[PDB]
C-alpha cells in the first residue's frame, strides 16, 4: 500500500535507481501519488533523473498525470528546462498543449524562462503559439516581460506565419466570393459576406500590428462599405482594383514569412513590400482620380505615406524619407484645405510618387 508507494516516490525524487527498479519489481504502484498528487514521473521530471523517467514510463507510468495544480510531468519538465526528458515524454504521447487551471502551457513555462531548446521542440510538435494564459499572455508575452529577447522574437515569428496562414484562409474565403459576385453582380448580400471577411481580417492585423495590412484593408473596406450603401455604382473596373489590392495584400502576406536570410534578402523584402504598397496607393490615386472631394480618403493616403515614411526613417532612405515627408506636407497642406484641390495638383503628386519609385529602383537595383 502506501509503503512501497512512499519509497517509490522517495527513490524516483532521490534519484535512486536501482531503488526503483527493486520497488517497481515488488508490485509497487507505479501512478501512487503524494498529497498534493505527484506521481513519481512528476517528480523524477522535476529533479531531472532521465534514467527513471524511462523506467517509469516503461512500466507503465502515466503521462499525462495532472496534479493538485493541474500540472503534466511535461509542464514541469519545460519549467526546469531538462531536453531529453521534454522529448522522452513527448515521445511518449504528452499532450504538448495540455493546460493547467491557470491556463499556462508548456511552452508559456519555456517561453518564460528563456529555455530555447525545448522551445523549438515543443513547437516542432505542434505547440500553440497564440496560447493564452488565465492573464490574455502568450509564451513571447511571458518571454520578454522577463527579458529573454531571443525566445520573444522567436515565438512573435511564429505567432507571425500562423496568423498569415489564418489570413490566406480568409483571402481564400474572399475570393470565392467575390467570384460569385462577379457573376451576379446583382446579389447584394454577397458584399455583405466580404465586408465582414475584410472586418475580421482588419481587426487581426490592428491586434497584432502590421499597420500597413490594416490600412489596405480599410481601403477594401471603405469600397464595399460605399457598395453597401449605394453610394456608387457596382462598376466591374472598381471590383477589378479591388482584386488588385487584395492580390497585393496576399503577397505582401507572403512577403512577411520570410526565410530567415541575410540583410541582402532583407533589403530586397523591404524593397517588395515598399513596390507593393506603392501599389496600393497608386490604386487608391486613380480612385481620386475619378472621385475626388472625399477627405476620408486623402487621410487613409496620408496614413499610408507616413507608415512609409517611418518604415523609411528606420531603415534609412533618406532620400526616400525627404520626398515622402515632402509628399506628406502637400497632403497636409490640402487637409485643412489651405490650397484648392486642383488636377495639377494630383498630377504632381503623381510625378513625385513616380521619382520615389524610381528611387527606390536604384537603391535595390
Known sequence: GSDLGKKLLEAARAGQDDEVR?????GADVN????????????????????????????????????????????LAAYTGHLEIVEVLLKNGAGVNATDVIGTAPLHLAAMWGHEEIVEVLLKNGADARAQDK????????????????????????????????????????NDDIKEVEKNPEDMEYWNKI?????????????????????????????VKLMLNSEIKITSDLIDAVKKMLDMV??????????NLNEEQYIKMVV?????????????????????????????????????????????????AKVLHTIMNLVDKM???????????????KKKLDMVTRELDKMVS
Open 195 to 223: 465586408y465582414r471577411l475584410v472586418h475580421t481580417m482588419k481587426e487581426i492585423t490592428e491586434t497584432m500590428g502590421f499597420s500597413p495590412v490594416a490600412l489596405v484593408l480599410e481601403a477594401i473596406m471603405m469600397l
Open 22 to 26: 527493486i520497488l517497481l519489481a515488488n
Open 32 to 75: 501512487t501519488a503524494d498529497e498534493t498528487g505527484f506521481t513519481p514521473l512528476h517528480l523524477a521530471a522535476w529533479e531531472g533523473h532521465l534514467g527513471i523517467v524511462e523506467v517509469l514510463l516503461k512500466n507503465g507510468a502515466d503521462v499525462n498525470a495532472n496534479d493538485e495544480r493541474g500540472h503534466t510531468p511535461l509542464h
Open 135 to 174: 492573464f490574455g499572455k502568450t509564451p513571447e508575452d511571458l518571454a520578454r516581460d522577463n527579458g529573454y529577447e531571443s525566445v520573444a522574437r522567436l515565438a512573435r515569428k511564429e505567432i507571425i506565419r500562423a496568423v498569415v496562414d489564418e489570413l490566406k484562409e480568409l483571402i481564400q474565403n474572399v
Open 272 to 320: 517588395d513590400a515598399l513596390k507593393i504598397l506603392i501599389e496600393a496607393v497608386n490604386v487608391l490615386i486613380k480612385m481620386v482620380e475619378k472621385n475626388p472631394e472625399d477627405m476620408e480618403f486623402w487621410n487613409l493616403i496620408y496614413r499610408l505615406v507616413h507608415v512609409m515614411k517611418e518604415v523609411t526613417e528606420t531603415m534609412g532612405f533618406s532620400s526616400v
Open 335 to 349: 487637409l485643412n484645405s489651405e490650397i484648392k484641390i486642383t488636377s495639377d495638383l494630383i498630377d504632381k503628386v
Open 250 to 259: 496576399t503577397r505582401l502576406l507572403d512577403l512577411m514569412v520570410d526565410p
